[PDB]
């Protein structure tokens, strides 16, 4: 059974499960269904937003925050309609409007994208917002032993 | 050692107010001294006090203390690496010692609870067994960790007497 480390509520039915529940948040079956769908939405938004962010960061150079700045109305109404329609449906059929291994790899790549986006958020906070995440990756590719996180004096104390 | 200024506090070694504090105290000592002829014992005692004041002020200068506007050293207890000797290391020493005292006490009270008459041994302390438990309490952090992991540190809820509420 694939697991988050060899030799350690959770069942095989949940797609792409690896035993990782230290806090046992998914212990509650009710909360477990909400947590499943919660992760699902999170990773879907994170794949799209990673793809966006790499594009915008690189777009005309700059960063994702640089191309960030009544304007909210148009997005708000459409997303509210879509989200209400998603909510109003029933469990395990509300997802696809119109196989298992595809879900497995989808969710795994999603978790990677979520973690990458969280890293983008952390790096933008830690750094002075000058270089973007792609630019930070390029810097790491330049001289990784001397531009890694410990050389950053904001991520760590004592410079 | 030379410490960086922190929280608007200059180092005591380079602080003019620290030098003024030293100067003032030493001058007071001299004044106290002047009335005594040098041969008499109070004169030597006061000179030794002056020496002690000088070496104290010097040691406080070198020990990386931060002084304020008043001119007296100020302790940094936020955890800063440059001022760990102010609170962290003596804090660790206190936590170790106090936990030793407490664990020696807990061990003795638990051991005496098995005696035929525990309350008499509570006031007449079995000194050999007491000292044995006291020196066993040198490894208090370990033994406390064992008790926590095994669940015997804390008594269960059902065994403890409580109010009827």
């Amino acid at each position: 059974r694939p697991m988050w480390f060899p030799g350690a509520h959770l069942r095989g039915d949940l797609p792409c499960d690896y035993g990782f529940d230290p806090l046992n948040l998914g212990e509650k079956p009710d909360n477990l269904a909400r947590y499943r769908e919660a992760e699902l939405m999170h990773a879907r938004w994170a794949m799209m937003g990673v793809a966006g962010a790499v594009g915008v960061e690189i777009a005309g150079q700059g960063d994702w925050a640089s191309a960030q700045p009544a304007v909210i109305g148009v997005n708000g109404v459409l997303v509210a309609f879509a989200e209400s329609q998603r909510q109003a449906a029933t469990g395990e059929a509300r997802l696809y409007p119109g196989f298992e291994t595809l879900k497995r790899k989808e969710l795994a790549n999603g978790r990677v994208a979520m973690m990458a986006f969280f890293g983008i958020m952390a790096q933008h906070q830690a750094d002075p917002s000058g270089p973007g995440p792609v630019k930070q990756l390029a810097n790491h590719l330049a001289d990784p032993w001397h531009v890694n996180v410990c050389t950053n004096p904001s991520a760590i104390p004592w410079l | 050692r030379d410490v960086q200024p922190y929280a608007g506090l200059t180092p005591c070694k380079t602080s003019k107010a620290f030098a003024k504090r030293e100067k003032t105290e030493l001058k007071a000592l001299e004044k106290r001294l002047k009335k005594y002829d040098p041969e008499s014992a109070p004169a030597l005692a006061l000179q030794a006090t002056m020496e002690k004041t000088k070496t104290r002020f010097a040691n406080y200068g070198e020990s990386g203390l931060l002084c304020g506007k008043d001119g007296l050293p100020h302790l940094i207890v936020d955890g800063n690496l440059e001022h760990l000797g102010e609170f962290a290391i003596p804090g660790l020493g206190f936590l170790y010692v106090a936990g030793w005292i407490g664990y020696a006490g807990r061990s003795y009270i638990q051991e005496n609870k098995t005696a035929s008459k525990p309350t008499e041994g509570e006031i007449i302390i079995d000194v050999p067994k007491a000292l044995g438990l006291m020196f066993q309490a040198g490894a208090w952090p370990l033994l406390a960790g064992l008790e926590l992991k095994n669940g015997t540190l804390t008594a269960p809820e059902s065994e403890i007497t409580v109010s009827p509420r």
């Binding site: - | 059902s158 403890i160 009827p164």
Partner: protein, 62 residues
Amino acid sequence: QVGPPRGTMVKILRPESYWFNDYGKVISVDQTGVRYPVVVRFEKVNYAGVSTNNYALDEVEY
């Protein structure tokens, strides 16, 4: 004979008891159908200084 045998340790269940949730030795159980037949003896004294009192069958557990 009903109730705990003599000599056993019984957990007190009376909420108001000084020795609530504590363990005490059973001295005797009265078989004449009294309301509180279980006599329980306690190592530790209460605020009144007594070391024993009477309990019902449902006010003890063993």
